[PDB]
Amino acid sequence: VNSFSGYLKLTDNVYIKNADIVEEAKKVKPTVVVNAANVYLKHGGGVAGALNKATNNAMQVESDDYIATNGPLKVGGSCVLSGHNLAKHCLHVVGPNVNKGEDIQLLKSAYENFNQHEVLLAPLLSAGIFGADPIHSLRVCVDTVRTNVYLAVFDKNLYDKLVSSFL
Ligand SMILES: O=C(Nc1ccc(C(=O)N[C@@H]2c3cccc(O)c3C[C@@H]2C(=O)O)c(O)c1)NC1CC1
């Protein structure tokens, strides 16, 4: 039993809810919140900008030190940093950005990072301003993640479409 509430169950391990992932992290304080990161951990907009803003820019400060030490992530890769006031940990995962021409096959590799954590609060990778089809992202998520994932979808219209079209 866990504290996530009001989710629709899609499969044995994947749950989804129309919710602002920022509001959901503050309320649950999950062990892991996933950020929709880029390779530079520059949290400007979309999900990333929102999570960083909620940390009063502490996420960005920590991220800049991480990059200065380690260099950029790989597309499809991840790193674990602090969850600040939102979660114990933040798993920064880089999905391909279609608006940069990145290979959509990297989306499966990106979701494989979730398998290193037993339970996660997460957004759909590569959706929103990353430019991929969210229906496809959900399919890849279900078919790749084996650990327990609770997906927050900000847009109600999109949430309904994801549920209604789910096979
Ligand atoms: O500002 C926020 N939250 C917040 C959450 C998500 C996002 C975001 O961009 N989502 C993305 C989005 C939007 C529309 C269609 C989409 O396919 C996606 C993918 C992604 C998502 O929905 O996962 C955001 O811009 C801000 N909270 C403050 C009031 C406290």
Q: Tell me, letter by letter, the H, E, C secondary structure of 23-87.
A: HHHHHHCCCEEEEECCCCCCCCCHHHHHHHHHCCCHHHHHHHHHHHHHCCCCCCCEEEEECCCCC
Mutation probe of ligand 1 site: the residue of 47, 53, 151, 156 with most atoms within 8 A of C-beta: 47
Task: Please report which helix (H) or strand (E) contains residue 125, including its range.
Answer: none
Cα–Cα distance, 136 to 107 (Å, whole number): 10
Question: What technique was this entry resolved by?
Answer: X-ray
Ligand 1 and 22: CB distance under 6 A: yes
CATH topology of domain 8-165: Leucine Aminopeptidase, subunit E; domain 1 (3.40.220)
How far, in Å, is the centroid of ligand 1 from the Cα of 25? Answer: 13
Q: Up-side HSE of residue 39: CA atoms within 13 Å toward CB? A: 11
Residue 5 DSSP one-character state? -
Quick check: CB of 34 below 6 Å from ligand 1?
A: no
- Asked whether the beta carbons of 15 and 161 are under 8 A apart, the reply is no
Q: Which of 164, 162, 101, 102 is nearest to 137 (CA)?
A: 162
Specify the residue for token string 């950020």: 35
Residue type for position 24: E
Helix, strand or coil for residue 128?
helix
Q: Work out whether the CA dihedral 158, 35, 24, 146 comes out positive or negative.
A: positive
CA angle 1, 93, 63 (to 5 degrees): 110
Mutate to test the pocket of ligand 1, among 126, 133, 154 (most ligand atoms within 8 A of CB): 154
Please check whether residue 127 is in contact with residue 160, taking contact to mean a CB–CB distance below 8 angstroms: no
Determine whether the shortest distance from the Cβ of 150 to ligand 1 is under 6 A.
Answer: no
8 A C-beta contact, residue 121 and residue 28 = yes
Q: Cα 75 from chain centroid?
A: 14
DSSP-derived secondary structure letter, 91: E
Kindly give the distance from the C-alpha atom of residue 74 to the centroid of ligand 1, in angstroms, as a whole number. 23
Please, are residues 137 and 127 in contact by the beta-carbon 8 Å criterion?
Answer: yes
d(CA 27, CA 98): 32
Query: Distance from the CA of 117 to the center of ligand 1, in angstroms?
Result: 23
